[PDB]
Amino acid sequence: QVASGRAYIHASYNNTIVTITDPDGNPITWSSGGVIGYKGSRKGTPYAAQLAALDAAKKAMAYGMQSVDVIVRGTGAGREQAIRALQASGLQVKSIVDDTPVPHNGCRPKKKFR
Amino acid sequence: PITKEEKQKVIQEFARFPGDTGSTEVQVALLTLRINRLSEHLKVHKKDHHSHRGLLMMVGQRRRLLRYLQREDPERYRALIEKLGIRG
Amino acid sequence: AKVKATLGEFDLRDYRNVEVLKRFLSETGKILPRRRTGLSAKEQRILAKTIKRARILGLLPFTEKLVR
Amino acid sequence: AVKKFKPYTPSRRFMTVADFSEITKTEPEKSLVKPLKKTGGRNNQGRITVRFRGGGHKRLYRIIDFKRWDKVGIPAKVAAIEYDPNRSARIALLHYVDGEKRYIIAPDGLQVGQQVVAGPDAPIQVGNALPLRFIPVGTVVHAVELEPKKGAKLARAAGTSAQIQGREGDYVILRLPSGELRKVHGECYATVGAVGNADHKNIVLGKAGRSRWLGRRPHVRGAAMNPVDHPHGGGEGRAPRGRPPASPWGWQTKGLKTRKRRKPSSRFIIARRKK
Amino acid sequence: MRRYEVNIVLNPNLDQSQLALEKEIIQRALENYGARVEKVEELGLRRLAYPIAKDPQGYFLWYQVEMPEDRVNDLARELRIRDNVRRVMVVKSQEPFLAN
RNA sequence: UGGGAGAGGGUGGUGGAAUUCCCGGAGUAGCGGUGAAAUGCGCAGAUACCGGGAGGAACGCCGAUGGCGAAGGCAGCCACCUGGUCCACCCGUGACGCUGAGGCGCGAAAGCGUGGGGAGCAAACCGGAUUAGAUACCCGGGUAGUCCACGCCCUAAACGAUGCGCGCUAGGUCUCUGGGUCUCCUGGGGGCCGAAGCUAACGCGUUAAGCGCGCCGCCUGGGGAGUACGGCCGCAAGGC
Ligand SMILES: [Mg+2]
Ligand SMILES: [Mg+2]
Ligand SMILES: [Mg+2]
Ligand SMILES: [Mg+2]
Ligand SMILES: [Mg+2]
Ligand SMILES: [Mg+2]
Ligand SMILES: [Mg+2]
Ligand SMILES: [Mg+2]
Ligand SMILES: [Mg+2]
Ligand SMILES: [Mg+2]
Ligand SMILES: [Mg+2]
Ligand SMILES: [Mg+2]
Ligand SMILES: [Mg+2]
Ligand SMILES: [Mg+2]
Ligand SMILES: [Mg+2]
Ligand SMILES: [Mg+2]
Ligand SMILES: [Mg+2]
Ligand SMILES: [Mg+2]
Ligand SMILES: [Mg+2]
Ligand SMILES: [Mg+2]
Ligand SMILES: [Mg+2]
Ligand SMILES: [Mg+2]
Ligand SMILES: [Mg+2]
Ligand SMILES: [Mg+2]
Ligand SMILES: [Mg+2]
Ligand SMILES: [Mg+2]
Ligand SMILES: [Mg+2]
Ligand SMILES: [Mg+2]
Ligand SMILES: [Mg+2]
Ligand SMILES: [Mg+2]
Ligand SMILES: [Mg+2]
Ligand SMILES: [Mg+2]
Ligand SMILES: [Mg+2]
Ligand SMILES: [Mg+2]
Ligand SMILES: [Mg+2]
Ligand SMILES: [Mg+2]
Ligand SMILES: [Mg+2]
Ligand SMILES: [Mg+2]
Ligand SMILES: [Mg+2]
Ligand SMILES: [Mg+2]
Ligand SMILES: [Mg+2]
Ligand SMILES: [Mg+2]
Ligand SMILES: [Mg+2]
Ligand SMILES: [Mg+2]
Ligand SMILES: [Mg+2]
Ligand SMILES: [Mg+2]
Ligand SMILES: [Mg+2]
Ligand SMILES: [Mg+2]
Ligand SMILES: [Mg+2]
Ligand SMILES: [Mg+2]
Ligand SMILES: [Mg+2]
Ligand SMILES: [Mg+2]
Ligand SMILES: [Mg+2]
Ligand SMILES: [Mg+2]
Ligand SMILES: [Mg+2]
Ligand SMILES: [Mg+2]
Ligand SMILES: [Mg+2]
Ligand SMILES: [Mg+2]
Ligand SMILES: [Mg+2]
Ligand SMILES: [Mg+2]
Ligand SMILES: [Mg+2]
Ligand SMILES: [Mg+2]
Ligand SMILES: [Mg+2]
Ligand SMILES: [Mg+2]
Ligand SMILES: [Mg+2]
Ligand SMILES: [Mg+2]
Ligand SMILES: [Mg+2]
Ligand SMILES: [Mg+2]
Ligand SMILES: [Mg+2]
Ligand SMILES: [Mg+2]
Ligand SMILES: [Mg+2]
């Protein structure tokens, strides 16, 4: 195991997926609106992300994980809840940094996003 | 482009008198000089239609001047066009 | 707070002036608006053209992460 | 730029001919031609082993320099570009400052009067040959040796080229004309640029006789034959295939792969071809 | 003839004498394409704003030169051939433009 | 003559972001998607995370109510080639002008021919929903095509639904770009509000839709019909 690693929050309008990694970015454990038995729209709610992070942090802590640099991608409804969840779990959140992908005008969006 | 040196040669070689910068003769030679470097530019860049509009304007412009000099002096007219090789 | 005021005389065509230029970028690497830059219409176009060069030369960033 | 014909015969409607406008010399170097034994697709038993061959125009073979590492360091001048009836590419005649005269495949954009040279130090320049390990990544290359010193084997047909994509130890990664990605040894030679005469594919033979000039005798469909001849033979009236479409010899011919599976070059084929 | 600034970044992890062979090639290329060197500002190693060829830094050359306009494109290309030349940006020399 | 601003056009290069695919690592029970679902994908190891590679397209911030062009239209950055245009000096020619039936060139998208390219997107098409139906909207897929080169097609709410040139008739405000003596004065553009006046009204108003002159295009009730016949053009679609 390792003392400290990172924490990645992928959160869209449909779901929030949390994955804990190590220093080198390789994953240690993950969770999401599905791992806490939510199916469908319920997966995108802030409570869903809360449980998802808490389950993701708990699994990580049970691997010796102590500290986390928080990396957030997406604009989902459960984004800002998931961040609160990480600190409140017992993990020592060192930093929080947004890394959401944004095209410098790349590929044509699906009709739904124009 | 066209350097001021080459530009002064056409003014020199066509000025009706040392000092003349806007007579019909030096105007046509100045235009013929633009027209020909552009005619050669559009032989390479055939897709450059915007510059071709400018080519057409210079062409019409030179034609109107030559219509004026041929009304005043058909001897100044013939002499100028043979020194520039026009009329096809 | 305006950048142009907080800076003495400078050449906004020198693209190698990372020290002057890096002050015109946001915390995330974006070319600042005029409401932050204090440059005019003519100055801002020239600034942007030179910032853009330095980004290509690797002297300036295209984009940075947001830290909180 | 292929040349066309007015429809003054039924066949001239469609016939196109190469323009030949790059050719500077119209009879071959006498010291570099030899007789080309026509075969008619017959082997040494006398049996047809490749159907529908023969009857084409007489040809002299032109000896082509497919090594070039023969003469490392010796600049040659491009003396002429010539027609070669044995390949799709044109060929270029080099006058080496040695005095030696050789033919190579004429790459695209090569000009009479320029100089080419072979070797590790050769300028990255159309017509120069280098070992693949010294050609910078991304360079379009042709006449490529497939194993070091065994001779240029790849990309020799008119218009083709291979693109260098990366390196890996002694080997380079090529994208072949087929679109396959393959490891080829770094010490293998290749020539900068693509093969010329790229318009070759746009020629429209235009009439049956033109195929006969090339040695191509008519091809007869299996569905035109009788059962003794062919899987598709026979039947009253016309007939669909009535079985998976087959060759004369009975193997399937729509998709049945035929590369040998346990072939050692498999360790070097990264990606099969495309399209 | 027109004045241009030729910016060049090199492989930062070379030795000093390999670096010299690269500059010698640059110098000959400059010389062969009709360039007239006037200045030379060689700041060398500089950490970059982003990785270039998986390298956080690169060796920065710079030449204020004068050359015939019809050749700068070929020159800038011939410079790009060597793989250690990771960036080349020729730029028309301009009179400064100043604020304050 | 000397200056200037600009996504004006053409060619050759080249930079980063992102999506997709591929290889390696780490990792496991779902992911995706919706109004809610399902199809779909996923223990044959997906999603989410990291390293690597290939390839196409489009250029975030700057960026604007902005700029340029005759219009269509033009937006990373570098160089070459090329057009238009404005301003200062008042130096040259001496009415050389304006418009313009025909003609000729340019002409968004889509479409067409021949090669090439193909990541994303997506007519057609297939599937999942919804519904009485659902040949739709919503979802998961997906072929042309979107991209490049050359050659065609020549259409449009091709709009300011406002032809071009010139002269004349209050100003206020904002902005782009020049020049000066740098409050400001003065040019050339781009908007707003308004004098007089115009208008059926809405509205227009020194960017006229005001007052005038020149020349061109065009209208003459609706439907039939931009159809038919004829002619010309086009590979076709179809255009005039
Ligand atoms: Mg959901
Ligand atoms: Mg400078
Ligand atoms: Mg023909
Ligand atoms: Mg005919
Ligand atoms: Mg030929
Ligand atoms: Mg003999
Ligand atoms: Mg034989
Ligand atoms: Mg025998
Ligand atoms: Mg026998
Ligand atoms: Mg025998
Ligand atoms: Mg056979
Ligand atoms: Mg035979
Ligand atoms: Mg040949
Ligand atoms: Mg052959
Ligand atoms: Mg090999
Ligand atoms: Mg054919
Ligand atoms: Mg033959
Ligand atoms: Mg055949
Ligand atoms: Mg047959
Ligand atoms: Mg039969
Ligand atoms: Mg029969
Ligand atoms: Mg028999
Ligand atoms: Mg039998
Ligand atoms: Mg039998
Ligand atoms: Mg038999
Ligand atoms: Mg049989
Ligand atoms: Mg049969
Ligand atoms: Mg029979
Ligand atoms: Mg039959
Ligand atoms: Mg029958
Ligand atoms: Mg029969
Ligand atoms: Mg059957
Ligand atoms: Mg069979
Ligand atoms: Mg077999
Ligand atoms: Mg293959
Ligand atoms: Mg290089
Ligand atoms: Mg001037
Ligand atoms: Mg994997
Ligand atoms: Mg299933
Ligand atoms: Mg298993
Ligand atoms: Mg690809
Ligand atoms: Mg005067
Ligand atoms: Mg006078
Ligand atoms: Mg069109
Ligand atoms: Mg189109
Ligand atoms: Mg097409
Ligand atoms: Mg596709
Ligand atoms: Mg269905
Ligand atoms: Mg449906
Ligand atoms: Mg129902
Ligand atoms: Mg039903
Ligand atoms: Mg769809
Ligand atoms: Mg899709
Ligand atoms: Mg696909
Ligand atoms: Mg409009
Ligand atoms: Mg109209
Ligand atoms: Mg009109
Ligand atoms: Mg305008
Ligand atoms: Mg105004
Ligand atoms: Mg009134
Ligand atoms: Mg009236
Ligand atoms: Mg009113
Ligand atoms: Mg009003
Ligand atoms: Mg008004
Ligand atoms: Mg006004
Ligand atoms: Mg009518
Ligand atoms: Mg009518
Ligand atoms: Mg119509
Ligand atoms: Mg009609
Ligand atoms: Mg008709
Ligand atoms: Mg009409």
Side-chain angles (χ1 to χ4, degrees), chain A residues 2-23 25-93 95-111 113-114, chain B residues 1-77 79-88, chain C, chain D residues 1-260 262-266 268-275, chain E residues 1-2 4-22 24-26 29-40 42-46 48-100:
Chain A
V2 290
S4 107
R6 324 183 193 191
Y8 285 89
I9 300 172
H10 179 90
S12 78
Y13 329 95
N14 279 297
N15 198 351
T16 296
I17 302 92
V18 189
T19 148
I20 311 301
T21 85
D22 51 47
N26 304 284
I28 300 176
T29 184
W30 69 274
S31 187
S32 71
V35 187
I36 52 262
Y38 280 169
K39 258 298 177 168
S41 55
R42 320 175 67 104
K43 281 188 293 174
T45 62
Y47 187 68
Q50 183 195 14
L51 307 191
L54 301 183
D55 185 23
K58 189 158 226 167
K59 293 177 178 182
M61 293 185 297
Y63 275 46
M65 183 56 56
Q66 272 194 20
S67 196
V68 271
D69 289 298
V70 171
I71 300 174
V72 166
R73 292 192 184 98
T75 346
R79 182 152 74 121
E80 302 301 336
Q81 175 75 353
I83 307 173
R84 263 202 211 75
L86 290 191
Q87 302 133 329
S89 68
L91 279 183
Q92 198 228 65
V93 176
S95 98
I96 305 152
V97 30
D98 200 272
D99 195 11
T100 298
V102 27
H104 296 8
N105 244 38
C107 307
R108 168 192 273 252
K110 246 159 291 163
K111 175 193 172 168
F113 312 121
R114 320 198 47 241
Chain B
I2 312 166
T3 62
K4 298 158 175 178
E5 278 61 21
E6 304 142 59
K7 175 148 183 170
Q8 280 311 136
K9 275 109 187 298
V10 240
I11 305 181
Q12 288 169 5
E13 197 45 53
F14 289 85
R16 302 239 318 287
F17 61 90
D20 159 52
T21 73
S23 82
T24 291
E25 280 84 355
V26 332
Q27 287 199 83
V28 172
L30 285 158
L31 290 181
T32 298
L33 169 57
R34 286 197 79 180
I35 287 157
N36 289 9
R37 293 226 204 275
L38 224 203
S39 197
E40 298 295 315
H41 161 76
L42 297 171
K43 276 161 184 162
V44 159
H45 304 279
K46 290 148 280 194
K47 301 302 195 188
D48 178 13
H49 298 302
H50 292 63
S51 297
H52 182 264
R53 173 171 176 258
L55 183 86
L56 290 173
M57 285 179 282
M58 302 166 199
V59 166
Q61 181 80 73
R62 174 177 76 183
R63 163 188 293 261
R64 299 194 287 275
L65 297 154
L66 299 178
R67 189 174 295 185
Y68 168 64
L69 190 42
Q70 206 221 34
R71 160 156 62 263
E72 302 291 300
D73 213 332
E75 237 297 88
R76 283 172 58 175
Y77 166 80
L80 164 76
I81 64 176
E82 223 190 52
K83 214 270 143 280
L84 288 158
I86 329 203
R87 192 132 155 72
Chain C
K2 297 278 185 295
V3 174
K4 181 203 182 74
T6 71
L7 272 178
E9 206 150 42
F10 53 95
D11 177 21
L12 53 158
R13 285 176 173 157
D14 187 3
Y15 40 85
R16 290 134 88 254
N17 222 315
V18 63
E19 296 300 325
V20 177
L21 286 179
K22 73 184 174 188
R23 300 203 48 193
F24 292 101
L25 302 172
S26 76
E27 181 217 342
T28 46
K30 313 185 189 159
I31 295 176
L32 287 191
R34 294 166 79 199
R35 45 170 279 253
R36 286 293 315 283
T37 311
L39 286 186
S40 57
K42 159 145 55 172
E43 289 165 332
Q44 177 88 175
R45 294 197 304 282
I46 301 181
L47 161 81
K49 174 175 301 303
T50 68
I51 294 183
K52 286 178 171 171
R53 285 146 167 242
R55 292 157 145 182
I56 302 179
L57 260 296
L59 301 165
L60 294 181
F62 283 98
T63 168
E64 283 315 310
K65 276 66 173 158
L66 173 139
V67 199
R68 316 200 155 184
Chain D
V2 86
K3 153 189 171 191
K4 305 173 58 57
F5 299 91
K6 272 168 173 269
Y8 59 80
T9 82
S11 303
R12 293 284 150 169
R13 280 217 122 91
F14 308 104
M15 204 171 315
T16 69
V17 291
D19 62 336
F20 307 135
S21 41
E22 288 286 317
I23 304 187
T24 57
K25 177 169 166 286
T26 64
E27 292 289 9
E29 207 46 45
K30 176 181 170 178
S31 74
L32 291 163
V33 293
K34 59 178 184 208
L36 206 151
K37 169 81 246 286
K38 279 193 332 185
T39 78
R42 272 86 169 163
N43 69 342
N44 58 351
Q45 297 163 326
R47 303 277 183 92
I48 291 177
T49 65
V50 172
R51 313 180 291 159
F52 315 130
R53 301 289 271 254
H57 198 298
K58 182 162 185 174
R59 295 166 175 178
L60 270 38
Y61 178 76
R62 284 101 174 123
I63 300 164
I64 317 298
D65 182 11
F66 282 133
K67 303 177 170 195
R68 299 208 46 185
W69 46 260
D70 268 322
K71 302 180 70 72
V72 163
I74 304 177
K77 180 176 140 190
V78 172
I81 297 189
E82 296 168 19
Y83 186 97
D84 187 341
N86 302 137
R87 63 188 35 81
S88 58
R90 307 311 183 200
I91 58 164
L93 168 69
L94 316 177
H95 291 183
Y96 282 77
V97 298
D98 240 6
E100 194 179 340
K101 301 187 173 172
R102 293 183 170 187
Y103 280 132
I104 64 146
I105 290 175
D108 199 84
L110 194 91
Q111 294 302 323
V112 173
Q114 86 185 68
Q115 282 188 206
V116 292
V117 55
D121 302 328
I124 306 314
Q125 210 53 55
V126 168
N128 297 359
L130 299 81
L132 278 169
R133 67 189 291 182
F134 307 119
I135 313 189
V137 181
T139 307
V140 164
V141 101
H142 81 275
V144 193
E145 287 191 305
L146 188 66
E147 277 182 301
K149 302 291 179 294
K150 290 187 182 175
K153 248 48 163 43
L154 307 179
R156 339 196 317 203
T160 68
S161 55
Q163 200 168 109
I164 290 176
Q165 298 291 116
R167 313 170 176 167
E168 182 166 272
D170 307 328
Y171 276 85
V172 322
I173 281 80
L174 293 193
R175 190 199 289 107
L176 310 184
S178 72
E180 163 181 301
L181 286 152
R182 197 204 196 269
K183 296 181 201 197
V184 177
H185 197 277
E187 295 297 333
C188 292
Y189 261 76
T191 305
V192 163
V195 173
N197 189 26
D199 278 332
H200 168 53
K201 61 184 178 185
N202 305 326
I203 281 179
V204 175
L205 292 189
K207 65 176 179 170
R210 200 129 175 265
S211 289
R212 308 299 305 282
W213 301 348
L214 302 164
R216 300 165 181 170
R217 306 183 54 239
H219 203 109
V220 41
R221 306 168 281 96
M225 306 175 175
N226 291 308
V228 271
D229 310 299
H230 195 289
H232 301 179
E236 286 292 287
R238 287 189 195 115
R241 279 99 267 177
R243 51 180 287 167
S247 83
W249 313 277
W251 38 266
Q252 305 190 20
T253 187
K254 299 281 186 163
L256 175 73
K257 280 187 181 188
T258 210
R259 164 168 248 253
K260 179 173 144 65
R262 287 174 303 102
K263 202 172 176 192
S265 71
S266 299
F268 304 91
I269 310 293
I270 298 175
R272 230 174 121 275
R273 62 195 187 268
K274 72 202 177 184
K275 282 186 131 69
Chain E
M1 297 282 254
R2 287 156 158 148
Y4 309 88
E5 299 172 24
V6 180
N7 306 256
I8 292 179
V9 197
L10 289 169
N11 193 331
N13 305 283
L14 306 163
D15 61 57
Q16 328 95 20
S17 287
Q18 291 170 7
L19 219 178
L21 309 180
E22 292 304 274
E24 176 78 290
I25 298 166
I26 300 177
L30 283 176
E31 187 150 350
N32 281 329
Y33 280 98
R36 260 204 62 257
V37 189
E38 302 176 358
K39 275 221 60 60
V40 40
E42 176 174 343
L43 273 90
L45 237 56
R46 308 192 56 186
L48 304 161
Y50 55 86
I52 281 183
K54 293 119 143 179
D55 229 293
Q57 35 180 216
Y59 204 92
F60 271 82
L61 265 56
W62 187 96
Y63 299 93
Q64 145 87 87
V65 307
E66 167 182 71
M67 72 179 59
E69 59 277 335
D70 43 301
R71 301 177 182 168
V72 350
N73 261 137
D74 294 296
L75 199 238
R77 178 196 329 153
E78 257 245 66
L79 302 191
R80 287 180 178 102
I81 294 212
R82 307 289 296 170
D83 299 327
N84 286 331
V85 174
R86 304 191 165 174
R87 286 284 196 274
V88 159
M89 177 170 100
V90 186
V91 146
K92 288 192 297 302
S93 266
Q94 276 181 289
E95 293 272 320
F97 187 85
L98 299 127
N100 304 131

